[PDB]
């Protein structure tokens, strides 16, 4: 494509969503993009089409605009079973193929949101006996199921050695998910500290841990 | 309505090939494309679109290299045949129409449901399973935030409980990740009263049942 | 290879059931007649406004084309 | 043989310089345009209404031609 | 306006060839029909009408036989090519515009002047000249109706004249008229006073000036 | 063609002459109709066309119609200078050639008409004696120039042997032409009597001799 979507957009239950889409004079909007939804253990599904039109059984609570020189979906009367990665299309005849902005992930709130609970659990004795170490971030107790999250190394960010999971469905109805560091017993042992950073919609949560210290 | 309906498994070793149909409800060929797509878990959708009779002179440049996404049709309806195999090759792959010309149109009319194509020759791995304890009362909030780290496993689903199943009732899990290396990632939290810290040491029980790997760590404040 | 007086000018390949519009350019029905609908009602090549009153069967092509589905190796 | 795609329907014999109807059939121009006001505004085959504002060039047959014109000994 | 211009003479000996143009004026061939057509002496107009390319594939079965009729065209512009040519090939050969299509619309657009086209190997022939007298005064009308009846002769020019020239104001000339033989024939009448029938007899002088044959005969009533 | 066209029509110095023309249903009327003017000594040309369409330099004073089931041609404020052959054109798809009526030749009348006077010649002493006779019918001062000559002997009309002239123009302004027909000695001898019968507008002028007779 030409230029990419906005990863997410999040709005409450009963209220209408507005995802947008961009791109360049011959695609997108001059000639119209289509609008899908996919969510995981779903099949994906075409909602809208040339200018506004929508396929048999699509409700008319979705909308769409070609206003000025973007598109546009509007999703009205919100639900939680709207929740999807929404995708915006083009075709250009400079890029001759079925060619797609990014995807803009639909978030429904139907509780209220908060920031996370996170503990952060240094590299324990087992895994120093076996010549290892992992720094593991465990994030609970969160609403909406997005965060981002960053390492640190006494005060540099951390960008290597770096993986994460997906969130879980808690029995009290709040998210939890996961982000681990990868070290050696020398990089674990060398430093004074590290530390886990959970941003979630305006405040970010970090948790500590010092490499030299004992309880 | 239009409807396609897709065929599930996909699991292969390295080098065979994989042969399937996606059904066609409601018309046929002739007048649009018709084209797959497919999706890697936790990434986006990658190209196998744009039909030209058979097969396609309008692809994604980076994609047909490899065993050519070789998914393309017979006597143009919905098939895939794709040959000499490899774990790289993983996706979730997808049937549907849309427009034509040397053009999507703009859009993709009818899905199907998405068949899981696996390809593996190793045998079921079990995890590396280190405990997790907190550093103090304060910082774990009050109560004892009490885990374990299970890593380096195949295929994802594993089992973690405490105490030999006599502590469940607060015990959460946590999601699997799968990353680069073709293994998981998983771990699990459980909340305990406080004044157990200094009395009763916890033990997580990981049970990897694809493989038959047990096994138990120990988890008090150090 | 097969000729350019066989070929269309949207996905510039062979044509088998041609029709042709008010500017005397020739396309395939079946992707042309849904392309003035799913792109627009305008002529690919000069780009004037052209919908699906206006484009019309082209039957001297159609029997050109015969000539060479009936016989050769390009089928 | 001259071809029967090659030819009109109203000298019936091979065109140089052809336009197609509405109905998708196609004349040589400078006999069928001067018959349209020389016998009338009709269709040579089905007969209905046609006149020169109708009657448009036919590019992919101005093509064929071309293709034997510039190589067979039709001339 | 447009024009055109014929050539003239046109006479030929038998087995001979007739090779000459017609000029096009404000037009050429291209999106007209161009043909000619023909009007023997005394007859109506016959076919050369609508042409194909150079030629014609719609002509009169019953005219294109003998040397084909071969005017058709040069180039497709205006000519005539008749060869090996006879006597009942003679007629007015005539260069138009028209229609087109296997049609020659229903207009002739332009015309030409006609090509007098003529054939004969024979000598100039003089008449058998024959005097012609009234049988009474009642049924001449009460004047002298006096006569001569000057037969096969060609070419079609002769004098009649009366009395050695002295009797002229008096004296009228019949057209001639040609026959299927190839040769003509003509008559004159003279009124005089019907007192000179009983006292002078008329001559009346005959010279086909063409052959200088001079025959002169008396006329009287018997 | 299909049908023919009426020999002539006669009409007076400043009147309208009328000229009909007839065919089937694909030709000279739903297929129009061209007219044409052609007169000994001078060139051939179109008159009206396409309904009443005319070439340049072809006046007001002709006009035309395709009335009904016919073609027609009108010409109004009559001249010597219109007198000519008129023909009427066809093409029908069934007969596919640049055919035509017959042609209607115009009479214009400048002066008062009447019919000829007529004096019949018997074969002469001269022509005997060659083993030949000729029995000659001389017509003169007749308007307008055109008469229709029938033959007869002893009461049965003759149709071999004859032959006629066109009429030539007399120093007074009227008409004369001459008939024909060829006799053998024998033939002219053994009847009793010979006449020629020249029609002319509603009268017929006859003159006889006799074989048997003399002077």
């Known amino acids: 494509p030409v230029l990419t979507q906005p990863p997410s957009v999040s709005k409450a239950l009963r209220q209408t969503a507005t995802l947008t889409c961009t791109g360049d004079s011959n695609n997108v909007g001059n000639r119209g993009a289509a609008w899908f939804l996919l969510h995981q253990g779903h099949p994906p599904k075409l909602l809208a089409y040339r200018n506004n039109d929508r396929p048999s059984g699509i409700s008319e609570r979705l909308s769409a605009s070609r206003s000025g020189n973007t598109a546009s979906l509007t999703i009205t009367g919100l639900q939680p079973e709207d929740e999807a990665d929404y995708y915006c299309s083009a075709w250009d005849s400079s890029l001759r193929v079925q060619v797609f902005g990014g995807g803009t992930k639909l978030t429904v709130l139907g509780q209220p949101k908060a920031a996370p609970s996170v503990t952060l659990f240094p590299p324990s004795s087992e895994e120093l006996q076996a010549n290892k170490a992992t720094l593991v971030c465990l994030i609970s107790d969160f609403y909406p199921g997005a965060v981002t999250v960053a390492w640190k190394a006494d005060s540099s960010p951390v960008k290597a050695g770096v993986e994460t999971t997906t969130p879980s469905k808690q029995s009290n109805n709040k998210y939890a998910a996961s982000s681990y560091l990868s070290l050696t017993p020398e990089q674990w042992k060398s430093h004074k500290s590290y530390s886990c950073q959970v941003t979630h919609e305006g405040s970010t949560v970090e948790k500590t841990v010092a490499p030299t210290e004992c309880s | 309505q239009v409807q396609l309906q897709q065929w599930g498994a996909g699991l292969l070793k390295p080098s065979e090939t994989l042969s399937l149909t996606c059904a066609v409800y409601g018309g046929s060929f002739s007048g649009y494309y018709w084209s797959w797509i497919r999706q890697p878990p936790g990434k986006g959708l990658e190209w196998i679109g744009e039909?030209?009779?058979?097969?396609?002179?309008n692809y994604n440049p980076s994609l047909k290299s490899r065993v050519t996404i070789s998914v393309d049709t017979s006597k143009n309806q919905f098939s895939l045949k794709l040959s000499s195999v490899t774990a790289a090759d993983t996706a979730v792959y997808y049937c549907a129409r849309g427009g034509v010309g040397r053009v999507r149109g703009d859009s993709m009319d009818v899905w199907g449901q998405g068949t899981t194509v696996t390809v593996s020759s190793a045998s079921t791995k079990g995890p590396s399973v280190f405990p997790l304890a907190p550093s103090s009362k304060s910082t774990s909030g009050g109560t004892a935030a009490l885990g374990c780290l299970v890593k380096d496993y195949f295929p994802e689903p594993v089992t973690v409980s405490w105490n030999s199943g006599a502590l469940t009732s607060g015990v959460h899990t946590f999601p699997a990740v799968l990353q680069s290396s073709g293994l998981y990632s998983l771990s699990s939290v459980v909340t305990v009263p406080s004044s157990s810290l200094g009395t009763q040491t916890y033990i997580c029980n990981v049970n990897h049942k694809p493989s038959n790997t047990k096994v138990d760590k120990k988890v008090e404040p150090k | 290879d097969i000729p350019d007086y066989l070929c269309g000018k949207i996905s510039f390949e062979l044509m088998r059931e041609p029709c042709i519009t008010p500017s005397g350019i020739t396309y395939d029905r079946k992707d042309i007649e849904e392309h003035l609908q799913r792109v627009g009602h305008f002529d690919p090549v000069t780009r004037s406004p052209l919908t699906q009153e206006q484009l019309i069967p082209n039957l001297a092509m159609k029997e050109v084309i015969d000539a060479f589905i009936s016989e050769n190796g390009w089928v | 043989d001259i071809p029967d795609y090659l030819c009109g329907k109203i000298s019936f014999e091979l065109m140089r310089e052809p336009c197609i109807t509405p109905s998708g059939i196609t004349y040589d121009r400078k006999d069928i345009e001067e018959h349209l006001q020389r016998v009338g505004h009709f269709d040579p085959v089905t007969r209905s209404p046609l006149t020169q504002e109708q009657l448009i060039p036919n590019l992919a047959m101005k093509e064929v031609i071309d293709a034997f014109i510039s190589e067979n000994g039709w001339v | 306006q447009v024009q055109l211009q014929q050539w003239g003479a046109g006479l030929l000996k038998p087995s001979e060839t007739l090779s000459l143009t017609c000029a096009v004026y404000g037009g050429s061939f291209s999106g007209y029909y161009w043909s000619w057509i023909r009007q023997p002496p005394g007859k109506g107009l016959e076919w050369?009408?609508?042409?194909?390319?150079?030629?014609?594939?719609?002509?009169?079965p019953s005219l294109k036989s003998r040397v084909t009729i071969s005017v058709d065209t040069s180039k497709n512009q205006f000519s005539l090519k008749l060869s090996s040519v006879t006597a009942a090939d003679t007629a007015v050969y005539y260069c138009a515009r028209g229609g087109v299509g296997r049609v020659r619309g229903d207009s002739m657009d332009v015309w030409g002047q006609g090509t007098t086209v003529t054939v004969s190997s024979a000598s100039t022939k003089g008449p058998s000249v024959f005097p012609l007298a009234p049988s009474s005064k009642s049924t001449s009308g009460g004047t002298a109706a006096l006569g001569c009846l000057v037969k096969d002769y060609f070419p079609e020019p002769v004098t009649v004249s009366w009395n050695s020239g002295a009797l002229t104001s008096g004296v009228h000339t019949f057209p001639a008229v040609l026959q299927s033989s190839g040769l003509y024939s003509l008559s004159s009448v003279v009124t005089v006073p019907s007192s000179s029938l009983g006292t002078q007899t008329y001559i009346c002088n005959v010279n086909h000036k063409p052959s200088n044959t001079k025959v002169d005969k008396k006329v009287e009533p018997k | 063609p299909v049908l023919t066209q009426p020999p002539s029509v006669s009409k007076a110095l400043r009147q309208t002459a009328t000229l009909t023309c007839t065919g089937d249903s694909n030709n000279v009327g739903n297929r129009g109709a061209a007219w044409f003017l052609l007169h000994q000594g001078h060139p051939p040309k179109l008159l009206a066309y396409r309904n009443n369409d005319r070439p340049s330099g072809i006046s007001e004073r002709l006009s035309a119609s395709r009335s009904g089931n016919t073609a027609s041609l009108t010409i109004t404020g009559l001249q010597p200078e219109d007198e000519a052959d008129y023909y009427c054109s066809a093409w029908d798809s069934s007969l596919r050639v640049q055919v035509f009526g017959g042609g209607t030749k115009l009479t214009v009348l400048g002066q008062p008409k009447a019919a000829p006077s007529v004096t019949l010649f018997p074969p002469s002493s001269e022509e005997l004696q060659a083993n030949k006779a000729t029995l000659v019918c001389l017509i003169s001062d007749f308007y307008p120039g055109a008469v229709t000559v029938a033959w007869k002997a002893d009461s049965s009309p003759v149709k071999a042997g004859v032959e006629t002239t066109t009429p030539s123009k007399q120093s007074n302004n009227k008409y004369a032409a001459s008939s024909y027909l060829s006799l053998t000695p024998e033939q002219w001898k053994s009847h009793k009597s010979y006449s020629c019968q020249v029609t002319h507008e509603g009268s017929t002028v006859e003159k006889t001799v006799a074989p048997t007779e003399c002077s």
């Open positions: 039909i030209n009779h058979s097969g396609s002179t």
